[PDB]
Structure 1
Amino acid sequence: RRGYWGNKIGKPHTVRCKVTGRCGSVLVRLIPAPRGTGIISAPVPKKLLLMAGIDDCYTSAGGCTATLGNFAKATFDAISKTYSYLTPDLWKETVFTKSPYQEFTDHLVKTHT
């Protein structure tokens, strides 16, 4: 989930909110950034964030980032939390639409599992 800096002009360029993600003494602090600053990070998370389409970000690390297996999994952990972070936009209540499992069950009553 991508978001904006402090104002709108369409097409989100950065992270919605300031989030973290930890994997066994490594953590990352993805901080939002204004347009055109580029991704300011180490080489390892610069891969992931660039592929994500998050084109602007400030970061900072803490702990042993030498063992990169932790470092990248902790980045990926942070990138997950974006839709698991509650924002005032999402406060309006969902309509609880029926599941595809329910509606399309008619074709699956043959022998299908």
Structure 2
Amino acid sequence: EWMPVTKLGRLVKDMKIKSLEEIYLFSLPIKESEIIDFFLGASLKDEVLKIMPVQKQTRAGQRTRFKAFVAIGDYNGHVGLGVKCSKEVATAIRGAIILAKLSIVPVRRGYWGNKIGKPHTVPCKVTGRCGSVLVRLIPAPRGTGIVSAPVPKKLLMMAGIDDCYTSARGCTATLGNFAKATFDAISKTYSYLTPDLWKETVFTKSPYQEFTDHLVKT
């Protein structure tokens, strides 16, 4: 099975964290991928964006390792991206899947014009940057689809963004920086202070405080 190593993992396994949004609310770090496996479960669909073989020069020759770029996420508002480099492709893929699970962030969806139905696009213009690669996401009308390059399109579809406008600048040919910039732009959606979020924050008890008695009762 799974023996939790962290307090958060123990709270999640003993069915007292209702949703993944509590941990996001209290900004706690996820160090066990089994928490994400417990909350998102079978809704998560991962895929390998790229396997980049990187070589280190040695006296005998070149030492080759393979870096796996993996994007994961249910198509409903959660997306993650994980990069792991290993001596073998299968190990790198497993590690990148674990890291992408650990890096899952909540995605905020919005409306382009009239607010009818479920939110379909990004709430506003967001920009992500990773080593000269700038990715800009612009709200798009319903039914537009993702107007983007294949890598940002894959990440945005995995994030559940129905339709979006995209701009890119810099060496987007480097898939890792392109994907990381898209992930940064996607994760900036919930950090953006819009007027609908001006309402004063009402604090609730932290999972570590609200369930401290259960933690110490062991």
Alpha-carbon deviation of 1:88?
Answer: 0.2
Alpha-carbon deviation of 1:77?
Answer: 0.5
Q: How far apart, in 1, do the equivalents of 2:207 and 2:174 lie?
A: 42
Residue by residue, what CA displacement relative to the aligned partner does 1:7-49 show, whole Å, maximum 9, x if unpaired?
1111001000001010010011100000111111011111110
Q: How far apart, in 2, do the equivalents of 1:66 and 1:6 lie?
A: 33
SS of structure 2 residue aligned to 1:60: strand
Alpha-carbon deviation of 1:107?
Answer: 1.7
SS of structure 1 residue aligned to 2:188: helix
User: Aligned pairs, how many?
Assistant: 111
Q: Which has the higher strand share?
A: 2
> Which gives a bigger RCO, structure 1 or 2 (Cα 8 Å, sep 6+)?
1
Alpha-carbon deviation of 1:60?
Answer: 1.1
Consecutive aligned runs of 4 or more in structure 1 exceeding 6 Å deviation:
none
Q: How far apart, in 2, do the equivalents of 1:47 and 1:101 lie?
A: 36
Unaligned runs of 5+ in 2: 1-107
Is 1:18 paired with 2:18? no
Percent of residue pairs identical: 96
Q: Indicate the RMSD between aligned Cα atoms, in angstroms.
A: 1.2
SS of structure 2 residue aligned to 1:20: strand
Residue by residue, what CA displacement relative to the aligned partner does 1:49-76 show, whole Å, maximum 9, x if unpaired?
0111101111111011111110000000
Counterpart for residue 78 of structure 2: none
Counterpart for residue 71 of structure 1: 178
SS of structure 2 residue aligned to 1:106: helix
SS of structure 2 residue aligned to 1:9: coil
Alpha-carbon deviation of 1:109?
Answer: 1.6
Alpha-carbon deviation of 1:98?
Answer: 1.3
Mean Cα deviation higher: 93-102 or 13-22:
93-102
Q: How far apart, in 2, do the equivalents of 1:15 and 1:99 lie?
A: 29
Unaligned runs of 5+ in 1: none
Residue by residue, what CA displacement relative to the aligned partner does 1:71-113 show, whole Å, maximum 9, x if unpaired?
0000000001001000001111011111121121112224xx9
Q: How far apart, in 1, do the equivalents of 2:174 and 2:116 lie?
A: 40
Is 1:62 paired with 2:148? no
Q: How far apart, in 2, do the equivalents of 1:59 and 1:108 lie?
A: 46
Q: How far apart, in 2, do the equivalents of 1:13 and 1:27 lie?
A: 23
